[PDB]
Design an enzyme around this catalytic site. Structure first.
Site, mmCIF file in Angstrom:
data_model
loop_
_atom_site.group_PDB
_atom_site.id
_atom_site.type_symbol
_atom_site.label_atom_id
_atom_site.label_comp_id
_atom_site.label_asym_id
_atom_site.label_seq_id
_atom_site.Cartn_x
_atom_site.Cartn_y
_atom_site.Cartn_z
ATOM 1 N N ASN A 1 0.814 -1.204 0.000
ATOM 2 C CA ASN A 1 0.000 0.000 0.000
ATOM 3 C C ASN A 1 0.849 1.257 0.000
ATOM 4 O O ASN A 1 1.958 1.275 0.542
ATOM 5 C CB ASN A 1 -0.918 0.014 1.227
ATOM 6 C CG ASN A 1 -0.240 0.595 2.460
ATOM 7 O OD1 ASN A 1 -0.195 1.813 2.640
ATOM 8 N ND2 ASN A 1 0.303 -0.275 3.306
ATOM 9 N N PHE B 1 -1.028 8.634 3.820
ATOM 10 C CA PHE B 1 -1.683 9.364 4.900
ATOM 11 C C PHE B 1 -2.971 10.089 4.498
ATOM 12 O O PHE B 1 -3.121 11.283 4.767
ATOM 13 C CB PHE B 1 -0.692 10.364 5.492
ATOM 14 C CG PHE B 1 0.256 9.805 6.512
ATOM 15 C CD1 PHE B 1 1.375 10.527 6.907
ATOM 16 C CD2 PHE B 1 0.042 8.555 7.071
ATOM 17 C CE1 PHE B 1 2.265 10.014 7.843
ATOM 18 C CE2 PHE B 1 0.930 8.033 8.010
ATOM 19 C CZ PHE B 1 2.038 8.762 8.395
HETATM 20 C C1 FMN Z 1 -3.623 -0.739 3.739
HETATM 21 C C2 FMN Z 1 -2.738 -0.396 4.946
HETATM 22 C C3 FMN Z 1 -2.738 0.844 5.548
HETATM 23 C C4 FMN Z 1 -1.910 1.184 6.702
HETATM 24 N N1 FMN Z 1 -1.950 2.437 7.288
HETATM 25 C C5 FMN Z 1 -1.185 2.696 8.357
HETATM 26 C C6 FMN Z 1 -1.204 3.996 9.023
HETATM 27 O O1 FMN Z 1 -1.929 4.928 8.629
HETATM 28 N N2 FMN Z 1 -0.398 4.170 10.109
HETATM 29 C C7 FMN Z 1 0.475 3.163 10.644
HETATM 30 O O2 FMN Z 1 1.135 3.447 11.609
HETATM 31 N N3 FMN Z 1 0.494 1.951 10.018
HETATM 32 C C8 FMN Z 1 -0.260 1.681 8.953
HETATM 33 N N4 FMN Z 1 -0.236 0.449 8.342
HETATM 34 C C9 FMN Z 1 0.669 -0.593 8.890
HETATM 35 C C10 FMN Z 1 0.035 -1.563 9.860
HETATM 36 O O3 FMN Z 1 -0.429 -0.860 11.037
HETATM 37 C C11 FMN Z 1 1.055 -2.636 10.330
HETATM 38 O O4 FMN Z 1 2.185 -1.974 10.996
HETATM 39 C C12 FMN Z 1 1.648 -3.485 9.194
HETATM 40 O O5 FMN Z 1 0.713 -3.606 8.090
HETATM 41 C C13 FMN Z 1 2.048 -4.877 9.615
HETATM 42 O O6 FMN Z 1 0.939 -5.665 10.059
HETATM 43 P P1 FMN Z 1 0.140 -6.720 9.160
HETATM 44 O O7 FMN Z 1 1.207 -7.537 8.419
HETATM 45 O O8 FMN Z 1 -0.703 -7.493 10.119
HETATM 46 O O9 FMN Z 1 -0.702 -5.873 8.216
HETATM 47 C C14 FMN Z 1 -1.045 0.127 7.211
HETATM 48 C C15 FMN Z 1 -1.064 -1.130 6.571
HETATM 49 C C16 FMN Z 1 -1.861 -1.439 5.479
HETATM 50 C C17 FMN Z 1 -1.790 -2.829 4.904
HETATM 51 O O1 ORO Z 2 -0.780 5.752 4.829
HETATM 52 C C1 ORO Z 2 0.125 5.090 4.258
HETATM 53 O O2 ORO Z 2 0.433 5.060 3.073
HETATM 54 C C2 ORO Z 2 0.879 4.249 5.289
HETATM 55 C C3 ORO Z 2 1.304 4.759 6.465
HETATM 56 C C4 ORO Z 2 2.038 3.891 7.390
HETATM 57 O O3 ORO Z 2 2.459 4.263 8.467
HETATM 58 N N1 ORO Z 2 2.225 2.587 6.943
HETATM 59 C C5 ORO Z 2 1.786 2.064 5.730
HETATM 60 O O4 ORO Z 2 1.999 0.902 5.411
HETATM 61 N N2 ORO Z 2 1.096 2.939 4.894
#
Ligand code: FMN
Ligand code: ORO
Ligand code: ILF
Length: 364
Positions: free
Chosen positions: A113, A117
């Protein structure tokens, strides 16, 4: 809410009809409306954890990014999560990157992704949380804490001030705040992970946090990347100790592309999540736990899709864990699955409860 039905039929069908972002928007809507399969699993005392000045009925939370604007908090608790983290939220509203900006890698049980933000902004989220502030106070007291993840605007001239604003506006509504300096999709954001800048940034953040009234004073955690050099990690550990940071979230998505990825979209720009990130995250948790001598609470995140995944992170040093990508593939039932498998594994490995297993690998 059969785990196999969602995993084998419902989710696959849903993903075949809707693109990633559309599926996500629908997910948020359904969750806020309570359109969820019944959460059969009942939390046992074994899963209860006390950390960050709060009680958590279970150690499984929803990671930041799913509910970016705080629209489905209650539905997420109904899903079975022990705690919910919303965000990232930026000071002013911003659209993020052009679409498509999220991609599925089915063959890798991963996602990439580059949202950038996209956020409704502090003001909108503030009022949305205020509308259920007392309801949350009771949930928190009930062992279901709320975390708020803070980001910064793309065209911001003062990064530290952006975070300071988030602390003042949403800090009074959160049990814990997250200073997210690990997004791979914001120009120069990860640079804030540097020692000099990090110390100055966090000193300002903690000052603002300490300036809040007692009952509105949240714990402050820093969310880091899984792509830090050994030196970067040493510096973060040092600053954390120096300033008394309350905890760490390990980790965010990776900008690396592990050999072996099969998805056709593996070379899309953005942060990679899911199974391919799992062990890289676990190892980062392991290192940070050691560097902080196990004195700093760690929320483990990255590729958690089963009880084993969760326990490996806990044994590596995590007091709590979060997941997101697993939810996108297996649906709501995955929350109960992870909790049930975790409880079974804890017993099977001789742990009286989650607390007993935190950092266990370091003691053998
Ligand atoms: C579509 C998407 C959007 C995310 N948006 C944010 C975000 O705004 N802020 C953040 O700190 N992490 C964000 N993350 C990261 C997740 O919080 C997490 O740290 C990371 O995806 C690992 O976990 P997972 O493998 O279970 O998804 C995002 C992840 C995905 C897949
Ligand atoms: O908003 C995003 O693009 C974003 C932020 C973040 O902290 N981590 C991530 O995977 N995507
Ligand atoms: O939110 C994504 N996926 C999801 C998801 F997490 C959860 C989801 C739900 C939520 C509530 C009830 C559901 O059961 C029902 F009501 F539908 F029967 C299904 C549907 C979803 F589509 C993302 C995010 C980023 S990419 C991506 C994706 O590829 O689908």
């Amino acid at each position: 809410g059969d785990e196999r039905f969602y995993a084998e039929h419902l989710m696959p069908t849903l993903q075949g009809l809707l693109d990633p972002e559309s599926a996500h928007r629908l997910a948020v809507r359904f969750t806020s409306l309570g359109l969820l399969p019944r959460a059969r699993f009942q939390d046992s005392d074994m899963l209860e954890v006390r950390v960050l000045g709060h009680k958590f009925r279970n150690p499984v939370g929803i990671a930041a990014g799913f509910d970016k604007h705080g629209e489905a908090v209650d539905g997420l608790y109904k899903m079975g999560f022990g705690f919910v983290e919303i965000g990232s939220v930026t000071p002013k509203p911003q659209e993020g990157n052009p679409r498509p900006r999220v991609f599925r890698l089915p063959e890798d049980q991963a996602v990439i992704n580059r949202y950038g933000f996209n956020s409704h902004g502090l003001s909108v989220v503030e009022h949305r949380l205020r509308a259920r502030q007392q309801k949350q106070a009771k949930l928190t007291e009930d062992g279901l804490p709320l975390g708020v993840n803070l980001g910064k605007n793309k065209t911001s001239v003062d990064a530290a001030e952006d975070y300071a604003e988030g602390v003042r506006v949403l800090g009074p509504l959160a049990d814990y705040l997250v200073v997210n300096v690990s997004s791979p999709n914001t120009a120069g954001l990860r640079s804030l992970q540097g020692k000099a800048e990090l110390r100055r940034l966090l000193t300002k953040v903690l000052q603002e946090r300490d300036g809040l009234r007692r009952v509105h004073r949240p714990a402050v955690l820093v969310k880091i990347a899984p792509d830090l050099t050994s030196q970067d990690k040493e510096d973060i550990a040092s600053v954390v100790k120096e300033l008394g940071i309350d905890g760490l979230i390990v980790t965010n998505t990776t900008v690396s592309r592990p050999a072996g990825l099969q998805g056709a979209l593996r070379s899309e720009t953005g942060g990679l999540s899911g199974k391919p990130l799992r062990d890289l995250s676990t190892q980062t948790i392991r290192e940070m736990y050691a560097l902080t001598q196990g004195r700093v609470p760690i929320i483990g995140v990255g590729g958690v899709s089963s009880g084993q995944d969760a326990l490996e992170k806990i044994r590596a040093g995590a007091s709590l864990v979060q997941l997101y990508t697993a939810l996108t593939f297996w649906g709501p039932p995955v929350v109960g699955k992870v909790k049930r498998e975790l409880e079974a594994l804890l017993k099977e490995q001789g742990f009286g409860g989650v607390t007993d297993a935190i950092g266990a690998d370091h003691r053998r």
